[PDB]
Design a binder for this molecule. Sequence first.
Ligand SMILES: [Mg+2]
Ligand SMILES: [Zn+2]
Ligand SMILES: [Zn+2]
Lengths: 1333, 99, 71
Amino acid sequence: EEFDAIKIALASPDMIRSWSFGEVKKPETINYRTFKPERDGLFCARIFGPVKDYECLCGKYKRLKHRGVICEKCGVEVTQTKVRRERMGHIELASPTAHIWFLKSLPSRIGLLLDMPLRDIERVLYFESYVVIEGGMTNLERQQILTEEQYLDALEEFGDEFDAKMGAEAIQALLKSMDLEQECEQLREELNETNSETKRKKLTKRIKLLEAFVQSGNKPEWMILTVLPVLPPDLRPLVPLDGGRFATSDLNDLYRRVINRNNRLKRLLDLAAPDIIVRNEKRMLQEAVDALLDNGRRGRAITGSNKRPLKSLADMIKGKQGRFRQNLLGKRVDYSGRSVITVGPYLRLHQCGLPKKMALELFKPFIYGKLELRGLATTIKAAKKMVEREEAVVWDILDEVIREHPVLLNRAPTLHRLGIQAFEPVLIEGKAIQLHPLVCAAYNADFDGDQMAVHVPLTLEAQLEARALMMSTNNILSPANGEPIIVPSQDVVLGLYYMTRDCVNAKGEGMVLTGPKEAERLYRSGLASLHARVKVRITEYEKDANGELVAKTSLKDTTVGRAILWMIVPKGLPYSIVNQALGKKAISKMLNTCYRILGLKPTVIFADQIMYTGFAYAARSGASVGIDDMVIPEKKHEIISEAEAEVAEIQEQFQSGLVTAGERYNKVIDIWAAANDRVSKAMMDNLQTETVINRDGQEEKQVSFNSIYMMADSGARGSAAQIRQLAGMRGLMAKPDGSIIETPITANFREGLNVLQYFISTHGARKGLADTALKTANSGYLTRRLVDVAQDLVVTEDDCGTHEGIMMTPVIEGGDVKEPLRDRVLGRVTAEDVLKPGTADILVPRNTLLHEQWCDLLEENSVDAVKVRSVVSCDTDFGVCAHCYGRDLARGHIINKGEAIGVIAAQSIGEPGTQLTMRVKNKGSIKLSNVKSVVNSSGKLVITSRNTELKLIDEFGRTKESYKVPYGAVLAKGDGEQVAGGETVANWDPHTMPVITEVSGFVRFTDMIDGQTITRQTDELTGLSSLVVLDSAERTAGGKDLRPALKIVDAQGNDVLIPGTDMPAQYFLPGKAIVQLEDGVQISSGDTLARIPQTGGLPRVADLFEARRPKEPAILAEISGIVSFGKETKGKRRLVITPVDGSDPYEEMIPKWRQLNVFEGERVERGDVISDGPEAPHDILRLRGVHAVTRYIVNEVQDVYRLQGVKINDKHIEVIVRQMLRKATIVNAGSSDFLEGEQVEYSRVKIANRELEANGKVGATYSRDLLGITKASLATESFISAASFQETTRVLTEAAVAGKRDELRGLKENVIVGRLIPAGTGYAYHQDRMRRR
Amino acid sequence: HARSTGSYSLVTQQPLGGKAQFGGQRFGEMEVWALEAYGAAYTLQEMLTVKSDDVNGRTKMYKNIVDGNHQMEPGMPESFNVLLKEIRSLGINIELEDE
Amino acid sequence: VTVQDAVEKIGNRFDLVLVAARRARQMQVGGKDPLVPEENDKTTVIALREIEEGLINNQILDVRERQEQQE
RNA sequence: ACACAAACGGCGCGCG
DNA sequence: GTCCTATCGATCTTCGGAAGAGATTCAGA
DNA sequence: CTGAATCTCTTCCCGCGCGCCGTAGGAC
Ligand SMILES: [Mg+2]
Ligand SMILES: [Zn+2]
Ligand SMILES: [Zn+2]
């Protein structure tokens, strides 16, 4: 039926009665002797509904015809039993009762309204302390809580000049007493006066709550339960585990307790029991209800004899076991099966093989239809009866049914959308499901026993959906990167690699062949060897400027295997690519380029022929491996013995005392490192070199045909490390602590390890397994967080309208680049026209899709950076615009509108995360940045700037290099000088911080006070003793009072002015500065005399996305002003930053231990590092956020994967960033009813300003806010999604008081209710559905 | 193991589980995301509504297959009703909005 | 068959499936027999073939239904 | 009368 | 033996862990 | 009204296969 939104509200007591169909009186369920439901009890038929079919228990009626009559004997309406599962019943509470969630939400909803702390009101609720009301006639109070004895004595003081109450009754009375609207206005007036922020925030929370509460349809007094609903019995079934011995059903048990607890209280109320007893009873009643809801939020959970905590109502909803995960977001599905996997070489890429047994089952409904279409089956049961036969005709029909029907196969757990793909089936006699080898790799299938699950699409729409998208032929390209995921297997690649290799001399070598046709025949006859060298005539095709393919013929010198393989190659590809040994490297780019040149359709067929050929000649090659293959270098013993002698010298020298233990230790490992590497040199060099061959007389050397070398060299499997261990030495090894054992594993594997050596290796092996075990668990919980926040985003616009964008550069770290700008700009769109080399000429339009050729064209030019539009900059409302996203990785061309990119990005990041772990240099020209420097008496330039950087150009005119040059460091290179490696950049102090006499003159102790501020440290054996400055935080009061500053002087009696300004040049000093160029000594501009003292993967990326402020962040400047100290250091040190215009009186509190890049008179600008250390992203957002923080975050995460060499496309990260700052903060009245200081979702405020400013009305001023993904997701507006994510109760409460209404935007909401999500296909329908609106 | 059709659990109309009982395979939560990654939606709709959680639709689907139509009626996942009842069984009032 | 080409004619993956299904149900139970020849294929493929030719398209389908209503 | 069928919740061990 | 009947809540083998943000809370300023 | 040193209810990959196993107290 039609509906569009979900709304949340608090049920007024009558509303429960409206839902009700009967009061449940008796705390009993069934007639245990003969199991009728208990009338008036937890399963009363007439309250809920008939137990059987359509008929009552007293059998007054026995057909549908009787619909619509009570039976006077046993009441229940003659109706379908299903109604029993639907209708609810109510309970009458003996006394008002408090709902716990509102009480004990982390911000106590009731407490906040009351402005009374959670702990206190609890006393009143539990009848252990009174709360007084209407006591203004006396010393008593509006709502003061008081001790029972305080109350009782107050009773002696006053008869009834007050009222004192306990329990929910008192709470509800207080709520009823609230002049709630005036209270908010009363508080609003207070806010205007409030002079302290800590007070303000507390206040702001309250008013906002009250405003929301009143504006909502909710009224607080309803929160106190008086009538209670009880779930329909069928939803709380009592299955007969063993006949009369039913399985436990907690919810019924809880009801049982409450009902009995309620009844017993009723009795005493009837009897008018003494007050103390009933008071206790009231609490015990509250206790039971409390348990019924949560059963654990109270001090102690209740448990049965089984000693397990009973499952409260909330339990079925909340958490991992909750409905959301248990049922809604994942569910068991009919027409499904699981099987063990196998590889079928004969299969074509689009095909899959499955067993007949499963197939016969899976398509039974289809079979019946065909049988009855055949007319062979008189009825369904007859059809089912025939199928039991498994008769030949059944198989004939099954083949007809399955003739082209697509099917779905998925491994578990899925990594990404490639994890599930569609296939066309073929039938198999066995029981395993057969998979094409090339595809399985993408699935990450390992045949060590992996199982797989199968599902069948039923309807026409699904079948087309499966064939159009999921079918394997469609999915050759990875979506995380527009690169072929289909690159052949280890075996397939190796066979071709062996085939493509050449032999210096071989059978049949040296003939001339007209073409591959005779080449195959000659090899097949055995008259010539596969890799024998040969001359051949060949034809190849070039596609013209438009694509028309024309042929050319030529002769080539080649090995035979290459010619035959060329026959498999389709037209339009140059022969040269195959005229070489083909390892996985060559095949990878060959296939990739082939597809782009020729398209998809030739590619898929081309892949199959490659796959078939590789297996065939891999078998012929007989590429076996044997122990003899592992040749060991004789140098292994020699180097080991040689190295051992040297290590003994180091140990002896330590015994001599000539070296420390640490130096002794680290020198030894270095000796081992050299020894191992020399072994690697000998081992690796020999194996590759191991072939000497005769060619028409005389001998020659060629790359070895050794099995082991071919396997590693081909890239099929292993690495140089593996062979080094096996043939060389297992090498240096470390404890679980990471400390290297001072002796490596000198032994290889070809010869066995010694016991201790092997025992040592166990530490490393287990550690690797240990890390993997927890990592795989930790990474999954990360991905779940990712998907939730990302899911909302969808491309809906074509263009958002922005001309703005971010600028792209190659990462320039560790000197020059470590990535190409070519790869990153690819597939994006410009923000502005590209400036051609030279000036004023534009090379590319302002919004060109930067596909391959233009990127090649750009890099051909001298470009260094380019500006591109971004999804974060995208101005789209409730979504994204296509042009901002640009190319689709899985399609090459621009994206189709209506696609939810967010899930794609999340998955793209998710898979690689598992692979993480949880356990002057060159030629160029010089350039400087953040430059401030002066020239010293030595004729060289020294840096006065506190953030100078060095960068270098390649004399082509493009710049790629960067370094930080310390403050006070002396520049060896000026003028933008040409430079080469070894011409080191500068003279700098990497050990300690200097202080520079920037002016030229005589250094004086003017205003540098002896004893109190500068003190002669003893300096021990030096003989000479040096005056040393002492810090404010350590020196006597005199150190504070007479703060010293290094001041130079000239003929004026004071330093010549700061160049261009009459200010004194005194350099205000920190402590530990040592001065022996004492008063009166000569000094020049820029000279210095001071020397002041200064991981992992998955967790690093994790907290980054959650954007946690680091443990101890760097201290950064803000505002453009000159700094100064005053509020002398006591706890925090205070500094004033004064902009010379507008807002001079800005000052901050700063920790004492941090070193400072400025002291007292330095002019500093916003965001400048006062100290190094991890930056809090929020402040980056605060200072210069949108573009800057994006680049910062993008680089940081990219580094983790760039370290691992994982080619994640950056644009996906931008998607996450979009959500991170989807929120915004307003500080303005503007001209809209947003609170003067308000936090909002950006889109809502953005559009509001669009109309508000279009009206000419003052738009509100806002800043965009940074939320960790976890925090952001929970903050989302569509509560349903957040409710399903985690911390359910804290979410629902949020919706409750708000009475929020959900419009079911996004995917998750639509998924839950099951209607078509706004995905590619569904979006079109949803788009048209709104067209109906 | 394979199942085309079979009984359903009382507390929730979703198919039984496992091999001992003739249960059906669980479409994992993560795998839905993968499906969501592709633009296919009708498949997903059919997945939960027809194949998992709609007595009315799946029965009607059953007949249509015998009728050779291979068409589904949209239906409404039953378990969703269960959740609504439970939430409504709390002190929360929750409703569906027509407009 | 595997298309990877008809999408060019209609220009969108999602529209291709949506439009194709619309046509498919016609030949499934709606009548309006296939326009492309038959090779014991299934209607999903048969309709898919019709668009693969560029023979059938949304605009033609819109024309086809509205003109047919007649009396 | 032309029709249902045997799981609710835990624990241990293994699996990719 | 079969079958009926009313609460259910103390003292015993307990502790077996730990990251991260809203109360309530320690020291004056 | 500032200060940390104090403070507790969220979360802990996806699926699968067996095996066992579930209120107390009493007409004597
Ligand atoms: Mg495996
Ligand atoms: Zn009756
Ligand atoms: Zn845009």
